[PDB]
Amino acid sequence: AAAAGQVFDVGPRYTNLSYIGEGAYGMVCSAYDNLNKVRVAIKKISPFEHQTYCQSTLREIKILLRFRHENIIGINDIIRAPTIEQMKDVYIVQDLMETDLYKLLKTQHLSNDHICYFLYQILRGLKYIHSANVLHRDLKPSNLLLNTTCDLKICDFGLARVADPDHDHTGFLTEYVADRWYRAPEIMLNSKGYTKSIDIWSVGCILAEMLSNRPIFPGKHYLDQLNHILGILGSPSQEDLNCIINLKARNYLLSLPHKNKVPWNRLFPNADSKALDLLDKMLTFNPHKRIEVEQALAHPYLEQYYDPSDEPIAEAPFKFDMELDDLPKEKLKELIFEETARFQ
Numbered sequence: 284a285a286a287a288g289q290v291f292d293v294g295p296r297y298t299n300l301s302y303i304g305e306g307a308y309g310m311v312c313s314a315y316d317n318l319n320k321v322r323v324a325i326k327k328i329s330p331f332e333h334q335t336y337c338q339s340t341l342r343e344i345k346i347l348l349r350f351r352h353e354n355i356i357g358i359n360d361i362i363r364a365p366t367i368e369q370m371k372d373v374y375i376v377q378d379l380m381e382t383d384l385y386k387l388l389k390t391q392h393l394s395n396d397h398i399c400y401f402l403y404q405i406l407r408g409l410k411y412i413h414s415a416n417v418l419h420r421d422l423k424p425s426n427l428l429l430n431t432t433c434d435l436k437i438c439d440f441g442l443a444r445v446a447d448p449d450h451d452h453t454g455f456l457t458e459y460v461a462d463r464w465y466r467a468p469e470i471m472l473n474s475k476g477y478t479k480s481i482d483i484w485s486v487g488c489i490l491a492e493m494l495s496n497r498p499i500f501p502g503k504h505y506l507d508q509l510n511h512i513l514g515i516l517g518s519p520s521q522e523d524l525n526c527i528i529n530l531k532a533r534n535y536l537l538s539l540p541h542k543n544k545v546p547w548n549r550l551f552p553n554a555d556s557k558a559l560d561l562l563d564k565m566l567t568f569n570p571h572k573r574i575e576v577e578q579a580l581a582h583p584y585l586e587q588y589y590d591p592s593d594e595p596i597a598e599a600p601f602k603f604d605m606e607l608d609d610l611p612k613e614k615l616k617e618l619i620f621e622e623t624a625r626f627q
């Protein structure tokens with residue numbers, strides 16, 4: 284059993300392992316694919332102890348196996364034991380991507396052309412995801428992979444859900460998992476994040492972060508996240524408040540001192556004015572007024588790339604809720620076993 288740091292048993296076919304990160308349920312290595320003669324990425328996942336780990340792992344696998352898109356990371360192979368009894372770990376083999384936008388923004392200035400092309404690819408992948416009735420719900424720079432030729436692939440569908448706008452409403456201050464800094468204001472107010480508009484907010488946050496190499500709304504906690512948003516957008520309008528019927532959320536917003544909108548050109552004086560027009564439309568407080576993915580693709584900022592015939596949609600949308608919250612981990616291990624069978 285070949286070792287890294289732990290068992291990383293991808294054995295004969297996958298060799299010359301190099302540690303390139305850790306994280307959720309396992310650890311990530313690069314490896315030489317002795318069959319296909321390319322370096323690949325391998326994610327070891329060890330989730331079968333914890334129901335919640337098994338949910339995230341089954342979601343990621345089910346979604347990434349169904350999706351086929353140039354801007355979404357695919358699964359090339361899956362390594363696991365031939366029996367459920369022997370299966371402790373699952374190895375997911377993917378295209379090796381040189382970096383992610385998080386690592387890139389820590390150290391590199393992006394040209395206006397790079398910002399434009401990266402946003403185009405994010406929205407092109409997102410159009411496919413949304414067309415499949417799926418919400419990503421955790422878009423952030425670390426979940427956007429890039430290779431040496433600036434090809435961008437969305438990854439990490441662990442928090443992804445089938446869209447359910449009918450059942451989106453909830454109380455004030457309802458608990459949430461996805462990264463605070465990329466959470467739409469309605470999450471803190473009255474939304475479960477079951478509508479496509481929560482992904483467009485996250486893209487808007489990522490566009491702002493590409494324009495300055497700093498998170499635009501770096502809240503330290505839940506209400507601080509809302510003060511950061513309202514610090515730039517200003518106090519919500521009467522019309523936007525009238526949309527918030529939940530009294531705890533409405534009265535919280537009414538309690539706050541009046542704030543005027545800060546103009547995007549003050550925050551980003553060297554930005555392309557078309558980029559700031561699109562940023563404004565993505566970071567709209569009211570999710571009903573917020574631009575949709577297909578409208579963002581058609582925005583003048585993206586006119587060099589925009590080609591709706593080359594912006595494919597999903598053949599096989601997820602019609603129905605993935606009924607995973609109440610499956611015991613033993614059922615979820617069986618589903619993961621069945622979902623991975625095609626690679627044996």
Ligand SMILES: Nc1ncnc2c1ncn2[C@@H]1O[C@H](COP(=O)(O)OP(=O)(O)NP(=O)(O)O)[C@@H](O)[C@H]1O
Nearest residue numbers: 303304305306307311324377378379380383438439
């Ligand atoms: N296909 C890939 N190619 C290269 N590096 C990758 C790839 N997928 C993930 N990584 C990196 O491996 C490290 C750990 O992976 P991680 O950031 O956890 O990826 P993820 O797919 O978003 N999964 P996770 O965050 O654990 O739910 C990070 O430095 C990632 O950027």
